[PDB]
Amino acid sequence: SPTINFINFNQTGTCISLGTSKGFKIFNCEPFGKFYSEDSGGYAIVEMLFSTSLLALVGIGDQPALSPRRLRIINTKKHSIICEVTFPTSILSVKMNKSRLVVLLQEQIYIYDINTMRLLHTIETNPNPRGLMAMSPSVANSYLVYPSPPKVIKNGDVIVFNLETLQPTMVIEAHKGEIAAMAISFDGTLMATASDKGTIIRVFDIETGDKIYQFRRGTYATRIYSISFSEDSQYLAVTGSSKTVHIFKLGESSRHFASLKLPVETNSHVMTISSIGSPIDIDTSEYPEPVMKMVPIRVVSSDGYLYNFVMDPERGGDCLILSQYSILM
């Protein structure tokens, strides 16, 4: 039985990247199935480009060849190695769209042309120990957002950086405290942020800097693990240490529009990621709660299961858990 170290969806929500102590795995979401697998060694980062065969790996450290300071770019259809780049400190994050690749270190950001692999720019950051950043999956609004703390008020400033021209566009005073999560809409239009107090979720317009939405999350401060826009930007999923997943609806303030309840059986210190899918149609029977259009949402947990929920786009509330599958069987 292997330990899970990393999980992510691809930019579309159709595939799952996963990295364990013994290899890495790649799944299709629906109909669920392993698409690729490898027993090489321990991995810390496994990141996809949308459904191309290119993926980026960083080994966790149980091998001389996969030090945490090394990005390796592989092709799964060719079984080839496109490239490898090394960095002065451990890699904390890797993000991609079809024009640029970004590697995130605690105090630097590296920005590459993804076809050439020519390094285009490097940003010197103040310490980002939590490896927080968000990158637009659309080339047309190709934006990267990353936290901008003071070098040890204004702890929750965020930098919006234009990847195409490699120049910063604005500073958003998003939060009063350290940033704890960030997401960017599929069209590179909106940004969503939360601070380490997880009480308030904010949504800004990238072009303006104008705060467009503010949601209250929970009552007492709890940690936030993830934020994700649905592709049409009408819903926003946030997961944190409460074992609850909250869905907020994007039309002063608002509490959450719906919630997902992961099974009581799961460990309570498990971290999760989610993605909200395009709506679909369901027959009433075979699922108590006659053909309504639900909104499907997927939640996958560190303990290694994928969960299928559906939300009622008009009534919200607590969402029904449709299904569950597992990784490494």
Swiss-Prot record:
Gene3D superfamilies: YVTN repeat-like/Quinoprotein amine dehydrogenase. Keywords: Autophagy, Endosome, Membrane, Phosphoprotein, Protein transport, Repeat, Transport, Vacuole, WD repeat. One of its GO terms (molecular function) is phosphatidylinositol-3-phosphate binding. A motif (L/FRRG motif) lies at residues 215-219. It comes from the Eukaryota. GO terms for cellular component: cell periphery; cytosol; endosome; endosome membrane; fungal-type vacuole membrane; PAS complex; phagophore; phagophore assembly site. Changing residue 244 to A: Impairs membrane-association. Changing residue 242 to A: Impairs membrane-association. GO terms for biological process: 1-phosphatidyl-1D-myo-inositol 3,5-bisphosphate metabolic process; autophagosome assembly; autophagy of mitochondrion; cytoplasm to vacuole targeting by the Cvt pathway; glycophagy; late endosome to vacuole transport; macroautophagy; nucleophagy. It is found in: Preautophagosomal structure membrane; Vacuole membrane; Endosome membrane. The keyword Repeat applies. The 377 first amino acids might form a beta-propeller domain involved in specific binding to phosphatidylinositol 3,5-bisphosphate (PIP2), leading to the association of the protein to the membrane. Association to the membrane can also occur through binding to phosphatidylinositol 3-monophosphate (PI3P). Belongs to the WD repeat PROPPIN family. Present with 1560 molecules/cell in log phase SD medium. Component of the PI(3,5)P2 regulatory complex, composed of ATG18, FIG4, FAB1, VAC14 and VAC7. VAC14 nucleates the assembly of the complex and serves as a scaffold. Interacts with ATG2, the ATG2-ATG18 complex being essential for autophagosome formation. Interacts with ATG9. Also interacts with VAC17. This is Autophagy-related protein 18. It comes from Saccharomyces cerevisiae (strain ATCC 204508 / S288c) (Baker's yeast).
